[PDB]
Every structure is written in C-alpha cells, then in structure tokens.
Amino acid sequence: MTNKEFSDGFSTLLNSFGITPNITLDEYEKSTFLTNAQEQLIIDIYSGRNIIYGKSFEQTEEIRRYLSNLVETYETSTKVTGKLGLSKDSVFFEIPQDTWFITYEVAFLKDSRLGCLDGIEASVVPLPQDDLYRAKDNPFRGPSKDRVLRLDIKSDLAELISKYNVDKYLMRYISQPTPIILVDLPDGLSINGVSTESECELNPVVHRAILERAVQLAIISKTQLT
Amino acid sequence: MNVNEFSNEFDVLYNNIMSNAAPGLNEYEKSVLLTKAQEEIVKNYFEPAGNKYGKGLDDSPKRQIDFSELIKVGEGVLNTSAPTITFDKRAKVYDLPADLFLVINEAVDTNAGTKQIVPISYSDYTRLMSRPYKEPVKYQAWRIITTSINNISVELIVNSNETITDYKVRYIRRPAPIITTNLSSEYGDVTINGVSTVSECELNPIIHSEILQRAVELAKAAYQGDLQASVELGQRSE
C-alpha cells in the first residue's frame, strides 16, 4: 500500500466523517501512529513476543517475508584507537549507528601465529561481563582462532577480545525502518528526523497489520481517559 | 404573485374587511413592511430555532424549495490588489461577492485536489494552532474572516506546499426589495435598499403568502404602537 492508500484505509477503518460517532486524524497523527505501530510490531516480531505470530526473527517464512527489508550487511576494517578496555588484546570497532539488533556478526583474522590458516573467519560470540573473567582463560568458550568475544560499550562501539589480531569485522543487523510519513510535514516537525514523505520499506504483507495496529493505537489515544 | 397582487391582497387583509377600518397604508409603507417581512421570513426559516417547526435550511422539502430561488454560486477574488496584514502568515486573502447574505457551502480547488472549507471558530483557531501540526485534515481547508471593508474578506489556510486555483462559494443571495410602485417623486426620491423602481419578489411563490401575512402582522403591530407589540413582534426579527 502507498501513502495515499495508507491514509484512505486509515480513514475508512476509523469511519471518519460517517454518521456514527467516530475519530478524525490529521496526516501528522496518522503518520505518528503508523510509525509507532510499525516499530512496535517489528520489535515484538523480532523478540517473538507477538501472541498472534509467536515467532522470532527468522523462525518461519512469514517472519522472513515481513522483516526481510531491514536486514543490512556491514563491513569495516578501521579500529578506534583511544579507548579503555578489559584486556590488552582488545580492539574497538564503530557500529553503523542505524543498527537495531545485531543478528549475524563475524570477524576475519590476520595474524602470522595461526600459520596456513591466515584469513580465518571467526565467530563473534556476544559474551556477558559475568563470564568474561572465567572465559578469558577458557579454551572452549574463550578467544581463539575460531571464536571472538564481543562486549558492547558506550558511544556505539563493539569491544572485540581476540587472541589473534582482528583485521576485518562483518555484520548483518536489523536497520532503523524508514518512518511512514504521509505528507511533507511543515518546518520544525519530523518523525525520526525525516520531514518529507517516507514510504514503508517492508513488504505489503505486513502493511495491513501495521494499519490495524495503528488504528488500535489511535482509538487507545482518544479513549484512554473516558 | 406580482407587486400589484401583493398590494391588493395587503389592502384586503389589512383594512378592507376590518369592522372599524383603519386608514389605508401608503405604497411606501406597504413596500417597507413587505421588505422587512421578507428579510424576517428568510432569517426565521434559515435557523431551525427561529420558526415553530424547528426546521432549518435543508430539514424538509419545503425548506429546500423556499431558498431554491435564493441560492447562488460564485467565486472569491484573490485579494492581492493591495497589501494587507493577515492574522496568519500562511493565509491567502480572498474577497467574497458583494450580494452575500449567508454562506452555506465553500470549497477550494488546489493542486492537491478539491478541499472543503470548514469555517473554524476563534476558540477552535486557538485550540488548533496549539497542536504540533497546525494544518487541516486531508480533504478540508480552514477559514477565518479577516479585515473586511465594503465586502467580506476571507483568510484561507490550506496545507503546506499547496496553491489555490479557485474558491467557489455557495451562498444565499441577498433578497431584493419588494416595491409596489415607482417611488420617484418630485418632492424627493425615496428608496428601500437604494432602488426606487418597481421590484418584484425574487423568491419562490411558495412563500409569497407567508411574506404577505408577516407584512400584515407588522402593519397591525405598528398600528397598535404600544411597547408590548413592538417588543413581542421584534422577537422574530432575529
């Protein structure tokens, strides 16, 4: 569905300007509620907390077809120099700053010590800080040629603890979806920092579910004190 | 029924049957009372509370057919002829037709399609400009009356990045006076609303009897002349 179709369906479902009591929204309010419904729905889908679906990020074909258009791949070889880490062999990499959740995260290694295995792809294991001390020396869950520990730190950074030098850092995350903005908003206004029209980038399959959730949010907004 | 029939039946209903007959009315007086009755009937019938039935402009077939001959459609002229101070920075000033009595429907044709104009009140203006958006809904536009001289000037507020192509106004034309005879005189030309020539009732014949009855009632109230009659029959001026 397009922005015009989004607005028209929103009005039709809300029974705007009908004879019965009803609710009429501005295009800014329609955009706000559509964006809120979109982001709520995709977060609930990713966490598997939607009772209707009850499935996780890629647990079935339906959810794949829903959130296929947020999956973005990223590559980086630059390392942030001045930072204080929890180990000597700690390197820091920037995050793209539009990430929502990291779903695939792997690290290529370039070191002489692992001879004839150079350029080995290594599995970045997100490790909590409780386990870090007892995982540094762990030969089965600690850093090694086939495994790297990533700890999240401030300023959108990723502290990669490896026994070998880390050359490249690969990611595949869920991106910020573009907001659903149905009209070029006036000066000052914006949704997610976007002022112009913005079409939903997901598939049309989930557009109608987003519309239903946005409508429900609208009625909740108008009918939370009565 | 033409002006001659108004005057003749006015005499018949006023003083040709009454027992202790009163002095007959001059044609200027009859024309005055007929015009006043015309405006009074129009104002009574436009507002539901103004008449005994509780029915307004379009609340029954009779009320439709009453104003059928008084409805007119025109266009507002863009008021870029001279500079002016608009209350709202993003409002385009338009001038309504001179012969305007009441506005019942307005519409504006923009590049984004036709949009119905909603006349927003001053309290609704204050409420709506307190919200973050400050623009109309999708298929409507907003309107407020601005500095008007000799004719109504109107401020149209549309959504951003929209240009107005035309501004049609379905209004009720100002009724023309009912004048029985050429009021030209050597002693001085008298006029009802600026016209001394004969002027027929330009409304449907369905309400000609109604206007005549109201004229007779006003004539007899003036004849009585006490404060009571004037006060109770002024309640229907509205």
UniProtKB/Swiss-Prot annotation, chain A:
Transmembrane stretches in the record are none
Intrachain S-S bonds: none
Q: Which UniProt keywords apply?
A: Virion
Oligomeric form and interacting partners: Homododecamer.
Is-annotated flag, keyword Hydrolase? Answer: no
Q: What else is known?
A: The barrel is composed of five stacked dodecameric ring structures. Podoviridae-like phages usually possess only one such ring. The tail is thus rather long.
Any idea where this protein resides?
A: Virion
The coiled-coil regions, if any, are none
Q: What is this protein called?
A: Ring protein 3
Q: Sum up the protein's function in the record's words.
A: Forms the tail multi-ring barrel with ring protein 1, ring protein 2 and ring protein 4.
GO CC terms on record? Answer: virion component
Task: Give the superkingdom in one word.
Answer: Viruses
From Swiss-Prot, chain B:
Please list which residues make up the signal peptide: none
What is the annotated localization of this protein? Virion
UniProt keyword terms in alphabetical order: Virion
Question: What is the predominant subcellular site recorded for this chain?
Answer: virion
A single cellular component GO annotation: virion component
Q: Could you confirm whether the keyword Ribonucleoprotein appears in this record? A: no
| This protein's record includes keyword Ribosomal protein | no
Q: How does it assemble?
A: Homododecamer.
What does the miscellaneous comment read? Answer: The barrel is composed of five stacked dodecameric ring structures. Rings 4 and 5 are both composed of gp34. Podoviridae-like phages usually possess only one such ring. The tail is thus rather long.
What's the protein here called?
Ring protein 4/5
